[PDB]
């Protein structure tokens, strides 16, 4: 009864220094659709759970949520190989999951427990995984790093690429332009990605950038502007950019036009610089999960009942993970000084006063 695959139309990308861009049509199989839906829904529930835990003071400090931007992390993953590389800023919960970590390890890190993916040492902004380099807290600092990871791919001749993400606010960082130059100079297989959710903390793009065409800021580097609310559009543009880089043509820019439902972070209500009506209009008209769901039901790739069942399974996965994250013990004080240096013999580190000594093992 179910169609095994269906064809969909996707918004044509605006181009900068490119003769042709990604196709304006693509095929989605039932199996892939089911996976993408489950993945985005898992990211959504994880972020909503994170919100709840933060209000309960179980999560502290920073907590940047990515709900509303799920077509980006899942779409980007769908267009690359597990052997490829990716790095982004601090709004990375989604990427940490799409790259391979379980909800359990992610939530336990947010709650600062021993079972956290970073052992409770990093928190919300610093999480790493196989071929995933964070999770970086200094705006723009991750761009040169991504270019460096790209340099390594070329150096070892693996035919792998590196996606390097930064936000619209970050786009005005000087080091990003320094990176553009070197990446083009050495034809690094680096995909510069600007996640444009319209605001840099509390500053709109129009008040922060003289030019709001982020996909063209690379100047000499080609670029394309993409609909960051459409999972298929992101997947297609990503496959196009990755293929471009694997061909040896050098770097390319990709601007994903998306939106964040929550404020900059937990302490930002998110309504001093934008209206509540703006946020809800985006949600009812462009929610990434809603858009995929409608496509799959209409094309008969899946039933509304099947998608609902997936939601139930996901909700339980989240709840079972949050239970573990809140019950898991904190790291033992005795390991406070662990992992300062790699591959070194053990040594002692000073605490609040000379009489407090912590052992440090690699």
């Amino acid at each position: 009864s179910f169609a095994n695959d269906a064809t969909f139309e996707i918004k044509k990308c605006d181009l900068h220094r490119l003769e042709e861009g990604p196709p304006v049509t693509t095929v989605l199989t039932r199996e892939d659709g089911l996976k993408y839906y489950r993945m985005m829904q898992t990211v959504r529930r994880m972020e909503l759970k994170a919100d709840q835990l933060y209000k309960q003071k179980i999560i502290r400090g920073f907590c940047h949520l990515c709900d509303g931007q799920e077509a980006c992390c899942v779409g980007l993953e769908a267009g690359i190989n597990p052997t490829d590389h990716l790095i982004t800023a601090y709004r990375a919960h989604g990427f940490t999951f799409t790259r391979g970590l379980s909800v359990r390890e992610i939530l336990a890190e947010l709650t600062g427990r021993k079972g956290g993916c970073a052992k409770g040492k990093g928190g919300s902004m610093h999480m790493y995984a196989k071929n995933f380099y964070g999770g970086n807290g200094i705006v723009g600092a991750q761009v040169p790093l991504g270019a460096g990871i790209a340099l390594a791919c070329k150096y070892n001749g693996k035919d792998e690429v590196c996606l390097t993400l930064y936000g619209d606010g970050a786009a005005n960082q000087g080091q990003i332009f320094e990176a553009y130059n070197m990446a083009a100079l050495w034809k690094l297989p680096c995909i510069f990605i600007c996640e444009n959710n319209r605001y840099g903390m509390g500053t709109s793009v129009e008040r922060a950038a003289a030019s709001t065409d982020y996909y063209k800021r690379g100047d000499f580097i080609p670029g394309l502007r993409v609909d960051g609310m459409d999972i298929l559009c992101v997947r297609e543009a990503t496959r196009f950019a990755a293929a471009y880089c694997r061909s040896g043509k050098g770097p390319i820019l990709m601007e994903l036009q998306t939106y964040r439902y929550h404020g900059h972070e937990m302490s930002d209500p998110g309504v001093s610089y934008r209206t509540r009506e703006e946020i809800q209009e985006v949600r009812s008209k462009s929610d990434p999960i809603m858009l995929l769901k409608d496509r799959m039901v209409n094309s008969n790739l899946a039933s509304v009942e099947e998608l609902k069942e997936i939601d139930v399974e996901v909700r339980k996965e989240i709840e079972d993970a949050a239970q573990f994250a809140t019950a898991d013990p904190e790291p033992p004080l005795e390991e406070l000084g662990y992992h300062i240096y790699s591959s070194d013999p053990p040594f002692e580190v000073r605490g609040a006063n000379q009489w407090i000594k912590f052992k440090s093992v690699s």
């Binding site: 400090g61 040492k121 200094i138 705006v139 005005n172 500053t203 001093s272 904190e330 912590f358």
Partner: protein, 330 residues
């Protein structure tokens, strides 16, 4: 006379100086329409407009450099860094463009500028957002560096900082912004100024000298309160200025107590306490010591996220008391 938070004290200081000199202006990320990342600049943009309160793009090296150029041209900018962790991207402009210029020009080019924002540890912000930069900046000639603790410190120092005709770094504290303090009519006046380079004795004492700056000053006073109940009187000194520090006040205190303990939130090696201890050993107060001076500092690790780990990475009252008892041998 009235309750005023550190945040509001800094706001009053800036508001008054802006009203007083049309050449003064504020610039930084979210300082205007957002009312400040930590609400320190609240209401200023509404009162003075786009020309005086300027929201900037996230380009540290760039807007810090613009601020320095405007100062060289005769204006008197207040450059805000969301946190000093981010000042590392713009540290060359602070050091090579601002601090060294008057000297290099042979006294022809002054640089009336202020760099301010929260410094040091906060609550669960992890390693890249918890670094204290007191020692780093205090290390450089041509610069003045202050680190206020309470409301009086905050207002008095920001006003003095703005009227000074040289670059001044004001290292604030995010955890202190919301703390209320009894604000006397003298501090309420638009003429209230605290001289840069002079320490303040927050508590008179005779058994031991305890020196600190910023937030830890409060923990020293708490430690002094506890010890007082046991017959131990601590003389607590609030540095106020990191460069040029008031060593005379500290030495005079040691000449009376014969004991010294330094308390800071930053990393230990090459920190603020190291300088104070070295200066004590080189000065006339060294022979007045009855026990070696010791240092209470943050743990020597990048700041961990986990609550229990972070708590043991910053000096606690019990750590201050422990070091004091070791020094007095009690």
């Amino acid at each position: 006379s009235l309750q005023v938070t550190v945040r509001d004290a800094i706001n009053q200081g800036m508001d008054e100086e802006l009203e007083r000199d049309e050449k003064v202006f504020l610039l930084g990320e979210e300082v205007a329409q957002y009312d400040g990342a930590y609400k320190v600049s609240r209401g200023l943009w509404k009162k003075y407009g786009d020309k005086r309160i300027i929201d900037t793009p996230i380009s540290e090296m760039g807007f810090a450099g613009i601020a320095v150029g405007a100062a060289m041209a005769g204006l008197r900018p207040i450059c805000e860094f969301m946190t000093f962790n981010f000042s590392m991207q713009a540290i060359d402009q602070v050091i090579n463009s601002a601090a060294k210029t008057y000297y290099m020009s042979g006294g022809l080019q002054p640089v009336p500028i202020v760099f301010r924002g929260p410094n040091g540890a906060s609550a669960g912000v992890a390693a890249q957002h918890s670094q204290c930069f007191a020692a780093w900046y205090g290390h450089c000639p041509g610069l003045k560096v202050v680190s206020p603790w309470n409301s009086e410190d905050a207002k008095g120092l920001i006003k003095s900082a703005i009227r000074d005709n040289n670059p001044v770094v004001v290292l604030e504290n995010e955890l202190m912004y919301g703390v209320p303090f009894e604000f006397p009519p003298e501090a309420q006046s638009k003429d209230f100024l605290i001289p840069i380079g002079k320490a303040k004795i927050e508590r008179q004492g005779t058994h031991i000298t305890v020196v600190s700056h910023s937030r830890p000053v409060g923990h020293c006073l708490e430690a002094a309160a506890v010890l007082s109940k046991e017959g131990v009187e601590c003389e607590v000194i609030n540095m106020r200025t990191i460069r040029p520090m008031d060593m005379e006040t500290i030495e005079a205190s040691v000449m009376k107590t014969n004991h010294l303990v330094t308390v800071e939130g930053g990393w230990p090696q090459f920190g603020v306490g190291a300088e104070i201890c070295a200066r004590i050993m080189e000065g006339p107060a060294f022979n007045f010591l009855d026990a070696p001076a010791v240092r209470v500092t943050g743990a020597d690790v990048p700041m961990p996220y986990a609550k229990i780990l972070e708590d043991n990475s910053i000096p606690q009252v019990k750590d201050i008391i422990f070091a004091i008892k070791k020094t007095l041998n009690i």
